[PDB]
A paper describes a structure:
Branched Ub chains are formed when two or more sites on a single Ub molecule are modified with Ub, creating distinct bifurcated architectures. Sophisticated mass spectrometry (MS) studies have revealed that a substantial number of [name] and [name] linkages coexist in branched heterotypic chains and these [name]–[name]-branched Ub chains have been connected to nuclear factor κB (NF-κB) signaling and proteasomal degradation. We engineer a [name]–[name] branch-specific nanobody and reveal the molecular basis of its specificity in crystal structures of nanobody-branched Ub chain complexes. The minimal branched Ub chain unit is commonly considered to be made up of three Ub moieties, with two distal Ub moieties linked to a single proximal Ub.
Using a synthetic yeast surface display nanobody library, we devised a screening strategy to obtain nanobodies capable of selectively binding to [name]–[name]-branched Ub chains. In four rounds of negative and positive selection, we removed undesired binders to unbranched [name]-linked or [name]-linked Ub chains and enriched for binders to [name]–[name]-branched [name] ((UbK48R, K63R),63Ub1–72-AVI*biotin), respectively. A promising candidate nanobody, [name], had submicromolar affinity (KD = 740 ± 140 nM) for (Ub),63Ub and exhibited good solubility in bacterial and mammalian cell expression. To elucidate how the nanobody can selectively recognize [name]–[name]-branched Ub chains, we determined cocrystal structures of branched (Ub),63Ub in complex with the original [name] and the affinity matured [name].3Q, respectively. In both structures, the branched Ub chain envelopes the nanobody and takes on a completely different conformation from the free [name]–[name]-branched [name] crystal structure. Superposition of the two nanobody complex structures revealed an almost identical global binding mode, with a slight rotation of the three Ub moieties relative to the Nb in the matured nanobody structure (Cα root-mean-squared deviation (r.m.s.d.)(Nb) = 0.71 Å; Cα-r.m.s.d.([name]) = 1.19 Å). In both structures, the C-terminal residues V70, L71 and L73 of the two distal Ub moieties mediate hydrophobic interactions with the nanobody’s CDRs. CDR3 inserts itself within the three Ub moieties of the branched [name] and forms extensive contacts with the region near the [name] linkage (left). In addition, residues of the CDR1 and CDR2 loops form interactions with the region of the [name] linkage (right). Notably, the remaining lysine residues of the branched chain are solvent exposed, indicating that additional Ub linkages would not impair nanobody binding. In conclusion, extensive interactions with Ub and direct recognition of both the [name] and [name] linkages by the nanobody provide a structural rationale for its high affinity and specificity toward [name]–[name]-branched Ub chains.
Author numbering:
A (entry chain D): 4 to 122
B (entry chain C), D (entry chain B): 1 to 76
C (entry chain A): 1 to 71
Amino acid sequence: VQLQESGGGLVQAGGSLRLSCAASGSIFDLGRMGWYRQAPGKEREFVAGIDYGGNTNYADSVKGRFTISRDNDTVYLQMNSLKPEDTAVYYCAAGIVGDVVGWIYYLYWGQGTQVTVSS
Amino acid sequence: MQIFVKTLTGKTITLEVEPSDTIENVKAKIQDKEGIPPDQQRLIFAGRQLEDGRTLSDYNIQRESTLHLVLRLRGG
Amino acid sequence: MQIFVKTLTGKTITLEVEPSDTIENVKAKIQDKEGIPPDQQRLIFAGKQLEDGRTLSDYNIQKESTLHLVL
Amino acid sequence: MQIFVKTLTGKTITLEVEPSDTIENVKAKIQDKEGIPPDQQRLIFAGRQLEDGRTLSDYNIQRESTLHLVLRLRGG
Ligand SMILES: [Cl-]
Ligand SMILES: [Cl-]
Ligand SMILES: [Mg+2]
Ligand SMILES: [Mg+2]
Ligand SMILES: [Mg+2]
Ligand SMILES: [Mg+2]
Ligand code: NA
C-alpha cells in the first residue's frame, strides 16, 4: 500500500483534526500530493495540494482553514474550524498535472479516512 | 472484444467493448463498476490520454489491451 | 496557461504557455518577450535546472508557478 | 525491435531493444537518448510500474509498444 490515510474521526463543529497519510516507497517522487474528499451523495472534490517545490493550493471552501504539509514519510492535512459540510471520506493521492490547465491526474490514492463533523 | 482497465495499485477490471466504442462509452462502463464519474476518469494508453470523442479503434486498442485509469480532479 | 519567470533580483515576467510546452519552447517565449537568447537562459524550478527537451507538465509545473531564470 | 517511450504530455521517442532487455537496460537507453538518469525514471506499461530487474518480455511488451515515462521529482 503506497498511501494509507489515518487520523479521521468524529469531531464537533468548530473543532480541528489532523489527517495523516503514510507514504511508502517513492510515492512522493511523482512531485505532487493531494487530499480530496467525497461527501455523501456528492462527487470527489479536490481539497488541498502540495508540489515538490513546497507550493500549496486549496479549494476555495477550505482556504484559510486547512493546511497541507509533508515530512519525510507523511502527508498531513491540518483541518481547523471544521464545518458540518466538511463531513466526507478524505483521500490522499499522488499525481501529475496533465494536458489541461487546472486539472490534476492522480495515479495513486489511498483507501480513505472518514471525517464526521457533528453539531 | 475484452479489454482490461487498471489503476496502478488497483485490481484489473475486464470490459466487453467493440473497437468502434468511443472512449466516452468505455468510461460509462467504468463508472458502472467503480463509481467514478466519466468526467473524473482519464484513461491512458501508449502514454497518451484517450480523448472522449474518439473510438478505441482510433488509438489502435485491440483485444487484451490494458488501459490505465487515473483520477482527474479540478485543482490548482 | 499563465506562468511566471523571475530572476532573483529582476522583474517578474508573465508567460502564456501550454502544459505540454517544452522548456526549449519556454525559453523561446522568454526570448520573444525579454530579448534574452535561449542559449543564455537556464530555468530552475524547485531548485533543479529544467532540461530543454522536457515539457512543463513533465516537471509537474502547474498554472501560476514561478520559474527562476539564471543567465 | 523498436519500442516507444513517451511522457504523458511529451512527444514520443523510440528505442532499439530486444525482448531479453531488462527494464534497467531500457532506462539506460532512455538516459542515452534523453539525458534522464535511470533513478529519475518511472516506467509504466499496462497500468503497472515496471520493475528494473524484469525484462521486456516478462511484461509482454511487444514491438512498437509504448512505455509511459513519469519523472521522479524531488525538491532541491
Ligand atoms: Cl488532531
Ligand atoms: Cl473535479
Ligand atoms: Mg454554507
Ligand atoms: Mg500509463
Ligand atoms: Mg523569437
Ligand atoms: Mg526531444
Ligand atoms: Na454510466
